Amino acid sequence: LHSEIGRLNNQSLLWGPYRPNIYFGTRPRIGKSLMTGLMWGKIESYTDFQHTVRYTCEQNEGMKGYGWDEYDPRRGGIQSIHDIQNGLDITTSFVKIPGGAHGGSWAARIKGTLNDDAPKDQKTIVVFYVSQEGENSELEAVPSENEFGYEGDVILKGRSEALGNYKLVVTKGKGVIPQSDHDLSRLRGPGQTVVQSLTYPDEVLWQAKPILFQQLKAGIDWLVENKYDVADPPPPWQVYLLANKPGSGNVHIVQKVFEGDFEFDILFSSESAGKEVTSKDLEREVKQATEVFGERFARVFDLKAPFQGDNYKKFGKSMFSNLIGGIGYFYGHSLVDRSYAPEYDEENEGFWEDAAEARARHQEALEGPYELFTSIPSRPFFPRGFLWDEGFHLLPIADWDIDLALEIIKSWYNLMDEDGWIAREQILGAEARSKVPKEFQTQYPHYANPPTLFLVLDNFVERLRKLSLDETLSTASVDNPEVGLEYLRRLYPLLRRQFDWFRKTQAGDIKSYDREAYSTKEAYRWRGRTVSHCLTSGLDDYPRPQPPHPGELHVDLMSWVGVMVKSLISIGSLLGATEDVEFYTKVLDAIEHNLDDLHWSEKEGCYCDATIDEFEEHKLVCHKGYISLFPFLTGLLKPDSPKLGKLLALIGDESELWSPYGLRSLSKKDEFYGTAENYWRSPVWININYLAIVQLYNIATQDGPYKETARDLYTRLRKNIVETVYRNWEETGFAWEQYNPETGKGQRTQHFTGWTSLVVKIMSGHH
Numbered sequence: 073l074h075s076e077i078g079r080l081n082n083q084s085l086l087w088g089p090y091r092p093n094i095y096f097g098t099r100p101r102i103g104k105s106l107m108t109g110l111m112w113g114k115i116e117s118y119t120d121f122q123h124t125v126r127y128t129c130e131q132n133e134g135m136k137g138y139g140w141d142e143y144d145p146r147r148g149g150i151q152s153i154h155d156i157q158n159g160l161d162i163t164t165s166f167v168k169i170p171g172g173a174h175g176g177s178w179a180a181r182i183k184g185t186l187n188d189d190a191p192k193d194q195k196t197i198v199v200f201y202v203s204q205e206g207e208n209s210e211l212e213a214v215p216s217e218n219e220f221g222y223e224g225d226v227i228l229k230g231r232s233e234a235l236g237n238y239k240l241v242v243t244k245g246k247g248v249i250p251q252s253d254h255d256l257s258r259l260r261g262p263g264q265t266v267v268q269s270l271t272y273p274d275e276v277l278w279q280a281k282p283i284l285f286q287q288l289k290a291g292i293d294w295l296v297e298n299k300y301d302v303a304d305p306p307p308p309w310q311v312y313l314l315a316n317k318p319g320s321g322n323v324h325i326v327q328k329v330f331e332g333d334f335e336f337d338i339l340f341s342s343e344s345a346g347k348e349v350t351s352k353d354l355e356r357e358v359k360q361a362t363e364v365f366g367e368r369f370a371r372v373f374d375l376k377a378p379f380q381g382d383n384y385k386k387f388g389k390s391m392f393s394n395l396i397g398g399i400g401y402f403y404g405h406s407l408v409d410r411s412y413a414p415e416y417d418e419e420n421e422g423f424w425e426d427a428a429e430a431r432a433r434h435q436e437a438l439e440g441p442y443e444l445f446t447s448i449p450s451r452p453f454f455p456r457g458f459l460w461d462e463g464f465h466l467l468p469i470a471d472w473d474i475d476l477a478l479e480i481i482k483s484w485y486n487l488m489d490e491d492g493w494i495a496r497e498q499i500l501g502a503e504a505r506s507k508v509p510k511e512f513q514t515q516y517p518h519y520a521n522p523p524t525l526f527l528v529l530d531n532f533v534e535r536l537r538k539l540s541l542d543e544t545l546s547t548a549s550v551d552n553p554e555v556g557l558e559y560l561r562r563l564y565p566l567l568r569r570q571f572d573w574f575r576k577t578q579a580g581d582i583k584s585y586d587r588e589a590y591s592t593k594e595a596y597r598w599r600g601r602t603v604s605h606c607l608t609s610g611l612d613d614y615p616r617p618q619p620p621h622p623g624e625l626h627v628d629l630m631s632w633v634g635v636m637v638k639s640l641i642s643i644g645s646l647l648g649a650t651e652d653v654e655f656y657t658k659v660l661d662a663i664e665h666n667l668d669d670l671h672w673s674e675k676e677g678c679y680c681d682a683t684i685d686e687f688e689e690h691k692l693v694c695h696k697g698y699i700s701l702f703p704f705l706t707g708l709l710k711p712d713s714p715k716l717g718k719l720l721a722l723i724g725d726e727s728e729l730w731s732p733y734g735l736r737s738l739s740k741k742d743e744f745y746g747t748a749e750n751y752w753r754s755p756v757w758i759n760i761n762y763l764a765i766v767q768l769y770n771i772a773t774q775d776g777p778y779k780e781t782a783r784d785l786y787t788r789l790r791k792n793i794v795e796t797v798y799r800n801w802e803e804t805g806f807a808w809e810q811y812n813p814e815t816g817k818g819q820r821t822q823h824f825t826g827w828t829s830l831v832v833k834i835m836s837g838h839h
């Protein structure tokens with residue numbers, strides 16, 4: 073049955089618009105296969121289209137906004153794009169139609185509606201770009217009956233091992249097609265849909281924009297050679313219409329030119345399924361997806377007071393849909409330093425300098441290929457897997473569809489190497505590398521990242537401990553406990569590998585110093601830190617011991633090990649791995665003690681990181697902020713704990729962490745408040761705030777001395793965080809990376825969906 077569900081999930085999730093790095097396109101979860109991409113741009117002159125054409129996601133003054141209104145990876149959804157430069161409001165509806173043996177069929181409707189400021193007679197060029205990679209596969213444009221192009225639909229017929237036989241149809245669409253009276257029309261036609269079928273070596277097919285432009289340049293060169301000139305030039309839109317030349321190849325360019333509003337459909341028909349997909353199929357299946365989307369949301373994301381109103385419902389749908397709509401499939405080689413240079417051990421004072429020298433050897437090389445199916449923080453700026461981000465992304469996603477979340481976790485864990493390392497930033501293939509300066513591509517096998525994916529596993533375990541085919545499949549791994557357990561059974565070794573890996577590579581040093589503590593074992597130090605940064609912790613510029621030092625201990629890291637060990641206890645125990653559960657219990661106990669012995673400041677009333685003095689003694693270094701609260705944030709303290717009580721005071725203290733907009737990353741009293749790049753040195757970040765809220769609720773709904781403070785802080789923090797993110801969404805249309813504690817303004821990057829989307833689950837409550 074486990075095997076059976078896997079196959080059914082496989083088949084359900086195969087197709088999607090799994091290209092979140094571009095405005096609109098599709099690919100299945102297969103490295104070397106069939107991909108599609110949308111491009112459009114207005115044309116007003118002989119030289120503007122190169123500047124106006126849209127393809128890869130960006131965000132600037134020319135673009136008002138864009139995103140998913142509704143989305144489910146099993147079903148499809150609807151995306152709207154508001155493009156200022158091109159005076160266009162676009163809608164891209166996509167839908168999956170199950171059947172056959174190759175992962176079903178799909179359709180999409182591209183609708184462009186000019187806005188009020190656009191010339192009513194604007195010419196918009198639209199391209200649908202189709203590529204296919206693989207050795208033993210074919211794809212061909214059925215030729216037109218007409219001389220110069222297509223009056224009606226474009227039919228591509230194709231075949232591969234993975235997809236079997238299929239056809240892909242670009243419909244004629246609705247809208248005015250401009251007509252040219254020029255002499256050129258005798259050779260190029262008056263104006264009509266055109267197709268160019270080309271061949272490039274497979275590994276460059278992703279480069280759709282240069283491939284298209286090469287064709288346009290060549291058409292223009294032909295005009296020049298053939299005496300079309302400035303005495304009597306064809307109109308721009310005809311100069312930029314490709315000579316129709318359909319045939320065989322691994323690239324197919326389908327080009328339409330419209331005057332005013334337009335729409336057209338894409339129909340993908342898997343031959344092994346029943347009849348081919350039609351535009352009436354599309355319309356109906358879109359209406360149906362909306363309905364199911366609506367019904368699922370009201371159930372899964374039932375927003376509690378005071379967010380039960382419609383304004384917040386719309387907000388929630390937008391935040392949720394953008395987060396789950398970010399899901400992509402990535403495939404290819406990564407850049408990794410496999411030297412394991414000894415300088416990376418950071419065992420001496422001044423290690424950052426040695427580590428730099430090693431990096432300057434540039435031993436990194438490409439390896440793989442790898443695949444990853446994951447949600448992402450940022451479509452415009454970094455559309456790719458980030459390890460601790462994903463832990464946050466999947467919390468709302470698991471609510472929606474635990475089986476999808478398990479799938480994403482599985483995908484991440486399949487990256488893990490023999491030693492137990494997963495790169496914290498997954499840059500898979502040349503398309504992905506195009507977004508990243510070469511200088512920042514290289515992953516380091518000694519760089520950890522918070523293991524927040526355990527939090528998702530935690531939530532699955534509690535769900536395990538306590539309809540349409542799609543609805544069925546979404547919860548199959550909880551409803552069928554045998555299946556849940558087999559999944560955990562298979563993942564459990566890699567979890568332990570990771571745990572062991574943290575203990576081997578991220579080890580702090582007690583024994584070499586005047587350090588005493590309940591345990592000589594439990595002590596941790598993030599590898600990879602520089603004078604100003606600690607990227608691997610995820611809190612980039614949060615203030616840490618100065619200077620960095622091999623004797624550092626980091627209270628956040630130990631807390632994460634604490635998270636992993638509690639998770640190992642629950643998972644081990646479901647699998648009766650008795651001897652390990654004994655090992656885990658001994659570790660947890662040592663951490664609880666060593667958190668106090670090594671990290672607690674009775675003086676400051678919070679946890680602190682620790683270094684080694686110029687006199688070689690263990691010195692606490694206290695920077696009141698997120699780090700300070702870690703044992704609490706990660707659920708490690710007893711609800712009666714006096715330490716927790718002092719942390720509650722710090723959290724609620726306005727002069728320290730408590731802004732009207734949420735918890736400040738760093739206290740206003742801290743000497744480093746607002747300094748440097750001020751990334752994690754004051755702003756309000758949603759992911760840590762989410763953790764505080766969850767922990768306040770836990771205390772609030774349980775007997776103890778702080779139940780009542782916890783309740784007030786929960787109530788208020790939930791309110792401040794949600795309302796801040798809502799307020800900014802209402803005014804700007806965006807989720808932001810972080811929020812200003814002075815003004816409440818969203819700042820840094822937009823389209824951060826992204827852990828800002830946690831706000832949908834904060835509104836939902838009932839933890």
Ligand SMILES: O=[N+]([O-])c1cc(NCCCCCCN2C[C@@H](O)[C@H](O)[C@@H](O)[C@@H]2CO)cc(-c2ccncc2)c1
Nearest residue numbers: 449452453454458460461507609610611612751820821
């Ligand atoms: O492609 N660009 O044009 C481009 C590339 C990049 N660089 C990508 C570098 C990786 C970001 C990590 C964020 N990061 C922060 C950490 O603090 C979290 O802990 C960490 O996990 C998350 C992970 O999301 C930035 C911009 C940009 C543009 C305009 N405005 C602002 C920024 C644009």
